[PDB]
Amino acid sequence: YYFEPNTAIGANGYKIIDNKNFYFRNGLPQIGVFKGPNGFEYFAPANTDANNIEGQAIRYQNRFLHLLGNIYYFGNNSKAVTGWQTINGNMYYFMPDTAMAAAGGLFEIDGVIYFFGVDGVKAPG
């Protein structure tokens, strides 16, 4: 995992405001799964956890997330997991660049072709 600090002043990229994390694009806060210093964080719709505001990064522990047609899973650290994962006995591969599940297609991972269902579960074989 790598993170490039948004050191430059202004409303852009990963920003800490009043001990809360936000992600800016076009000078405006965004909802989504974006890279922070210690992993992909969930910058979430308001009141997803403990009355957070729109775009505030939240606690989101050991849960799947469906967002804008993409599938994620968040560990106990509230950061999106990457790579091969087994959850409730099903295998998933979360593309490490976005943390999005491989889903609804054939994917070649480390030189091997697997099929992933639309729910992101790797077909056994």
Quick gist of this model?
By secondary structure, the protein is mainly beta.
Topology diagram in text:
Blueprint: E1 13-17, E2 20-25, E3 28-29, E4 32-36, E5 39-44, E6 56-57, E7 63-67, E8 70-74, E9 83-87, E10 90-95, E11 100-101, E12 105-109, E13 112-116
Antiparallel strand pairs: 1-2, 2-3, 4-5, 5-6, 7-8, 9-10, 10-11, 12-13
Note down, in words, how this protein is organized.
- The protein is mostly beta strands.
- The chain has one domain: Cholin Binding (left handed beta-beta-3-solenoid).
- The protein is 0% helix and 47% strand.
- The chain contains no helices and 13 strands.
- Strands 1-2-3 form a three-stranded antiparallel β-sheet, with no helix packed on it. A three-stranded antiparallel β-sheet has the order 4-5-6, with no helix packed on it.
- Strand 4 and strand 5 form a beta hairpin.
